Amino acid sequence: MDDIYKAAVEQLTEEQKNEFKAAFDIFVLGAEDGCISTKELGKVMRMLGQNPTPEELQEMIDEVDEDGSGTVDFDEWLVMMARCMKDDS
Ligand SMILES: [Ca+2]
Numbered sequence: 761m762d763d764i765y766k767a768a769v770e771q772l773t774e775e776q777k778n779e780f781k782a783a784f785d786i787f788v789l790g791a792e793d794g795c796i797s798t799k800e801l802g803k804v805m806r807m808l809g810q811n812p813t814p815e816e817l818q819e820m821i822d823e824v825d826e827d828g829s830g831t832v833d834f835d836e837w838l839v840m841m842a843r844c845m846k847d848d849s
Contacts, residue, residue: 761826762839769842780838795831 769776787804788794798817805812822828824836832840 762843764846765839765842768845769839772842777838780841781834784834784837795833796837797831801832 784796785794787796787801790800791797798814798821801821802812802814802817805817818830821830821832824832824840826836
């Protein structure tokens with residue numbers, strides 16, 4: 761986990777948290793338990809306009825998955841976006 765990311769995500773707006781919880785549910789719409797595997801995550805990438813390799817997907821998911829279960833949950837997912845905020849020169 762990362763307190764630096766949760767600190768910024770926690771100070772977010774109600775609309776933000778609601779958005780992540782929504783977009784996340786739309787992605788897991790195919791799953792049965794409610795998660796996103798690198799296998800499917802790669803397919804959705806097409807929507808964004810990018811088509812990264814399959815093995816590369818799990819790469820970014822490795823540093824994200826704190827439990828290393830092999831998939832991204834609503835928890836690791838939400839923080840995933842927040843991490844994009846700290847991405848500055
Ligand atoms: Ca996980």
